[PDB]
Symmetry: C4
Subunit: 503 residues, 4 copies
Amino acid sequence: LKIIQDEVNSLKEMLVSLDQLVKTEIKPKVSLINTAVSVSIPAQISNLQTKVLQKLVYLEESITKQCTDTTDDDKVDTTIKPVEYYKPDGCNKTNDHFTMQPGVNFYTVPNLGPSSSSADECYTNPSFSIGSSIYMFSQEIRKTDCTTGEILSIQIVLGRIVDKGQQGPQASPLLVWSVPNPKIINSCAVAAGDETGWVLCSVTLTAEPIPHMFDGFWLYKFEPDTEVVAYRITGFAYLLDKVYDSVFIGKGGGIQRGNDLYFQMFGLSRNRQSIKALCEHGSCLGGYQVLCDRAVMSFGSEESLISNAYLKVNDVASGKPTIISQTFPPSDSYKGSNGRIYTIGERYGIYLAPSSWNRYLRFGLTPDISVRSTTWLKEKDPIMKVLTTCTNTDKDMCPEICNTRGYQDIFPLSEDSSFYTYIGITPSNEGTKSFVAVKDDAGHVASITILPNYYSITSATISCFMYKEEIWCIAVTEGRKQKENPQRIYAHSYRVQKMCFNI
Amino acid sequence: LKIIQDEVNSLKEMLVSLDQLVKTEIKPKVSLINTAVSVSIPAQISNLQTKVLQKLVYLEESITKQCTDTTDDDKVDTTIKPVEYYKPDGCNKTNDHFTMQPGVNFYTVPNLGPSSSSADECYTNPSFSIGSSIYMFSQEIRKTDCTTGEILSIQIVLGRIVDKGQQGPQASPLLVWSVPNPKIINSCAVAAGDETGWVLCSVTLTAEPIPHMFDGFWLYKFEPDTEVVAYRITGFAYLLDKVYDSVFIGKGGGIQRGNDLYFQMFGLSRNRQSIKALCEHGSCLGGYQVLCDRAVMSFGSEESLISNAYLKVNDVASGKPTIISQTFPPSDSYKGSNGRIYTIGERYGIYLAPSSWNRYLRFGLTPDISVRSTTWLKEKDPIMKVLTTCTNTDKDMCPEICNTRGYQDIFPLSEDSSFYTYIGITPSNEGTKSFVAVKDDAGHVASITILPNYYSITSATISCFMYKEEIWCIAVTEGRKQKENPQRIYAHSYRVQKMCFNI
Amino acid sequence: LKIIQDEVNSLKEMLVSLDQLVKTEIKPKVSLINTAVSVSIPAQISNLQTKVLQKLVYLEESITKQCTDTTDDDKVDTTIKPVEYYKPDGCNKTNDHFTMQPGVNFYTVPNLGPSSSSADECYTNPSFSIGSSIYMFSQEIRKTDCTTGEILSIQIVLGRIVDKGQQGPQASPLLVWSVPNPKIINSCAVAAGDETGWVLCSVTLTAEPIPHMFDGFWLYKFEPDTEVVAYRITGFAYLLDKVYDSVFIGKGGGIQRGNDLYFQMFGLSRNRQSIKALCEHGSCLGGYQVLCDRAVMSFGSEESLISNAYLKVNDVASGKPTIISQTFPPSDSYKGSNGRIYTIGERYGIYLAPSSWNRYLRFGLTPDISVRSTTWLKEKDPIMKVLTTCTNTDKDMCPEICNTRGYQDIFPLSEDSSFYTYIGITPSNEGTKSFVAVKDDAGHVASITILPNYYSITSATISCFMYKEEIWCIAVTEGRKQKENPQRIYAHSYRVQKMCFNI
Amino acid sequence: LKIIQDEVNSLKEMLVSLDQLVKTEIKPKVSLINTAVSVSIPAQISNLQTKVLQKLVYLEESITKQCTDTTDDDKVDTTIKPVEYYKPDGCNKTNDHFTMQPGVNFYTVPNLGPSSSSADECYTNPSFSIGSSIYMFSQEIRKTDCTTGEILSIQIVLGRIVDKGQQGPQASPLLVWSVPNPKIINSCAVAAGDETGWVLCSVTLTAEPIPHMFDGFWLYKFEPDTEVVAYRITGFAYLLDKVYDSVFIGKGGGIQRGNDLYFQMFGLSRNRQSIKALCEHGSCLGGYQVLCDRAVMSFGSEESLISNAYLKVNDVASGKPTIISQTFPPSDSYKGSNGRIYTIGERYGIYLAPSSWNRYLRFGLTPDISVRSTTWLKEKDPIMKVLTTCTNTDKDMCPEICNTRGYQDIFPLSEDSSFYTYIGITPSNEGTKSFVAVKDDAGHVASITILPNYYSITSATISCFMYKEEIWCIAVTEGRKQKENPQRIYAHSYRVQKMCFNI
Ligand SMILES: *[C@@H]1O[C@H](CO)[C@@H](O)[C@H](O)[C@H]1NC(C)=O
Ligand SMILES: *[C@@H]1O[C@H](CO)[C@@H](O)[C@H](O)[C@H]1NC(C)=O
């Protein structure tokens, strides 16, 4: 028996030595190689190409004629920049119209994140954000039913945007992570800054979880070639404006400004006051105001409303972050829904998806992130026409009790959001049809048809950046190639052209 | 004893942690690196080379004179395209003949798939197909005897065709897989489409297997960076036209059209009717018709015939595929054999290898995959002269009872198969001799000798594609370098030149 | 029980086989790949770029006009060279002043060595040295308190300086190692030569260690793709000039000359003689001499002084090295401190950091490494203004009892150190401010502000080399990006410009 | 106890699964990556460089003026070719002398094979051969004493010669292997052909081994990405001409011609006849003939001689090789020694190292590998002056009883070996001095000094090939950098220039 208690001890020493070898020598070197081949070499080849071709241009000029700063110094990878809006330089003449249009191509961006073949799995609720160099992506994997199924796993993919010699920008994953205990999460969303990514997840109560109940938040910090740091925000670490029974983090993601993070949230809150719901519609014909009020109530109850709010995460650098919210009144909003926080130069913007009877674009601008300073846009495009149970029309948009569960955001191409890019989706008898469009400040829309070989697309989120000194955008969508396929997440890219037309 | 039940439990935790590390971190990163070095970097360097050289061409033009679309957007890798047939543009003049000829080079394409040195192993029955970007390859590994030996393993190698700076196209393996329980498989064949590969295997009964008996099929789906999905097709999931005792899948492979797969099959079927076998021969001299009838019977039995059939796999996207066959009558065919399904523009073609007394090319064209719509070609070349026990001549091809076990297919270079490329093999007293040839529509054959340093080549299969805007072909053959070597699978490439001769 | 003693034995055989596979096949190949992607490929691409661009230059010259040695042969990597000082070629004219200035850029050099996110860890006491091709880096990781905390680990990173297509030189790690039993080390420092690195560590006594006691040294030899060789230097293997109770190795590092190594050391030594401390100051007004004497005493004791010494490691190639020291008298120095040994052509230099009341630059030159041959410079810049408890002024620098714990070295750009480069740090109410400067031989200083987005920088060490045929320097600093961050080590690079001004 | 017999079984399943994963997925992919980064990418970049630079040359020609085959098709890697001797094209004029000289550079070729830092290990007896694309290298590792120490291991390194953008050719290892049971091996040598390497080892008897006794041979076959195949040649599988008590394989290596291998061997053989030893010397003055006879006897015994022989390995492709030898008479040779077999066009050559009193070059040519057809050269250079106990002079070379244990071979640069390259070594009071030289057919020697920073070099072997269309040579030597270093194996390269001088 001593030899046994001895032989087992021998196995322990051999197993520990092997485990140390894999963690100490091999894992580190494999990570270094991944970066060298996926990021660094492509960057070196790209710089070579640019310099050689530019010299050849000077030779072309010479033959015909003779016959026959400080800002990028702290950057690791300078392939992309934050968006620098186009200006009408020289388009201030009589009858000379400055506009923007999408290009004719819609290129694939493969391997944005991992996937699978199992028909029992569904990929949904993508959250995508592009920072100054890096991108954050997150995808929920649910069992069978996509919307009401169990969460099997949430996957976060930190990576970089690089130039690989293709017609558009390409993704390069550096770190993939799987959130522990996914079964107790209501929702997660991402945010990104300078070489740092953030994830904020809202969690629930347990008895096995108790569905859509609220019990604080988790915050995760992601860095290149570094371990993930988790923080628990509970107890007195958070303060909500209204009392919430159920809290969700808005799908579209958040932003980082200085030492604070901003996210959009929505949820089910307690109410002890009468309301006058916002009720804007066309020439439909008292009854409509009643419907507008019942449209924001949970189960028709005067005391429990579904509403939107701003969520601020304070002082992240201290290691002990706190959360403070500010809620929108029912008089200046519609039934609470998934939204997104934008940074627009020195100003901010907010997108709120349709979820009720009003299917018009709801997007606002503000000098600071607060409720009382928000000014709403008067544009209508896009109108959400999919994943809805509403029977009203796109002209009058009359109030009724119905629901919508889609998401189609926009990306501002100017400081006042007078110009913007979006993807439209129209239902048909054979899946869906869709297009890319840019709306100008005169109300005109330039549009090009996309993805003719996909059975259906149900959603879209857009993030733009500078690449090769012009604006490029990446769109992430959910859909199916063939009618019988499970739902998967796809990504494509396109360019925005500057044009000026002499009328 | 508790410390033992404790020390063992400690080993379990350490072993699980190590296993998770290798599967979670290392395997994924190694796969990403393989793609980066074998596919992505080569693509980037190739694009650089093309752009720089083209600019230099413009400079050459400048000096002398002054003194002294939407289709590839959804593609991951655009190195190759489906074949675009050459047209006689400007060869419509009097006495001006449009033709095609092979080039003078026959380049090696190394590492198409893995191999071994053991003299106890034989590599045979290759199945090769090139899709829109990817290729599928499969090789059987048998013990000692090559044809009648036990199957040790079947290996499937999914990979891509890339440009590595060599004189021709090169292979780049991405995924290698070994079919489980190979001992119960009669045969497997491959098919490929757009980034998806398929494998169909016919299986037998068990008591240890019972030789050449039939018990349904297995279908496997292969995708890049994805797990392999297997389906069992048995019970009422398949319906055969005739009752078969033994079913084999044709070696040459199949195609994918829309949501269906098409394969060629052959096997031993029950018969209750009299027959009049197809019996076409030259000026040999009642007795011949009798021999032609007994040539298609198993063991001379009127009731059991060996015949060919089309095999269709219906609705693969549903996850629950079914199989339906359609059998060729004995009056329009010869003893059943290994064949191949071709896609020729909007039309289809079928190749049937010689297996009996008739050794002439048997190839047909059809508007749809059915028996009654097939029209057979009247060309003879190539004539199979190897691996045969027949003693007839190449002129009269007189009926007798004999067998042939080779395979030499062709690849159409025009919609009506009036032009095509093939490899001829002629036996000698020192292994074999062979050549590459292209037959034109006037019946002329251009040919170039190949592989002068190989003792023998016994078979060949050809797949063609566009590369660097001209047609290139890859030939996969079985053979031996030196007389005493075991049989191995080799691959080489060549180009097809466009020529027009003013007579 | 036999089956158990048998099943365990089976596990042993399987575990040994697996461990051998990882050590024999995989580890070696991973190391070879790391070099190929991080060093060899970048070198090949860089050489291509240079040759192509130079040819294009000749074409530019041709168009306009016609219209419209043996020294690097033994080198593995020729990207960098030892510094070749600039000369005033053609600046010997009347009113024509030869000078040197820093460039305007300060580029990031990422991944010089590994790091971490834990807030409980602090990275301090960096030691950095650049050899003929390779570099040595070492960083101490302490728990919580940075200066008085426990040592958790010391990490040594041997690597190479390479060209990766960026604006400046970049680091490429080859070997990372962790010194065993870090808890018994007083301090470590690095040195580097031709493809060989060295580390010298001073160790203490144990009872758990006994704080700042002395018990000999360890020497480690580092080579590329090779195991680390350790030597113990104790007993009669070392001889110190004075009797030391506590010995530390100077932070800045040492040099290799022929078969010997030279390091700076300092420590607490026994004294039986009266002293007259060096006491140089300005127009402050007997009392000052008394303060100057008590400033070099430990706890005010006449018998125990803190002093500097040279440390020589003799005959390293024999495998049995020995150590001999030579101590500086209190009459020609100040309280002992961290320093650095320099090689300046055929001559040597020594830097001694401020640690007491005198905060002016203390740097000397010598024809050989000995105390009696050292001649001190009369320059003042830089003056250390951070990490000090002194209340004197930068003009008079009056004696008092105080302490300083910073480190800001210089790098000579000429044989007589009449020109040199340094980094200045000035404290403010919001962390610190800093700049890069080059002082010329007329006493003028050219300076450029750096790192505007870093809350604070507390130290700097500079190493220079030739790159792309001009002098480039890498500065390694300790600091924080945001006020609440833990301390981390950062590295940046800049260039030194040659200028000549016609007055 | 059942739970124990159960928990152990669980560990077995987990360990087997992990072992299969590492062998099935990871090992294969790592090997593919090594080739991609070390061989394939460098080849692609090199081809780019050549094509771009050649176009630029044509542009240079254009500006000034206008103003201001089938043989490599079967090759995997075409970087190098077998030597094509230079011809005096246009040097057939009066007073116009055709010659060859070495270049001035002697470049390092790093990582030819692995090494170590342990001072207890010595690397000796290198065997190096270059084939049509690949190279074979083998190094013995002995404990402490280098010549009489125990063999710890023999390491074989199969690799390729590639272009990495450096001034000369570089090595790229693909497969490293360690011969099992090295303790029973007398000696090993390598040979190489077309993508196949061979190793032949002579083994001894065991009681623990019995020193220098003979018991047959082992043959190993090495192929890229393939397992090593071993064969035992014993019993009646070999037949030696004379009866040998002890057999060694000549250090320099062998060749492959068709299906046979040729090696040089030497050993201790039985003798029953009187002898008349070859005794060629200068004007020294019966006694000398007696010394010449005793110089070839073992321990002075008439019945036991030390002699050379040819060793042929017959029919390697069959898998059952046999060995037949043919011995040189004492009347046409000197004491047996290490030699080398050369292929010189259609003819063969043999090199025999000095081992006795005659220290002049001994090299012969033959139309076939046999004793009776060998014709010896009359050149003297090089004369071996190191590792000898002889006291005779380089002029008369008088017979005595002494021994020499060096090795300095030559490489023919012409069909008749009238031109050749060699490395000379001259002893001094400070290690050794050496040079590279080329001897022409007029007896003139061009020489250049090498390795000025190496304490000593004791041996050299040379293999030449075509690279960038001119002859390049790699020399492998044994030596020490610093006096106190252990012996290690180094490799360097140089070029042979074609010159023609008008007198
Ligand atoms: C050949 O076809 C071209 C059109 O592709 C036509 O322009 C030309 O006239 C035709 N030539 C003859 C001889 O028919
Ligand atoms: C040298 O040989 C060339 C042929 O290679 C021949 O044309 C020439 O005339 C010869 N010159 C002399 C002097 O023989």
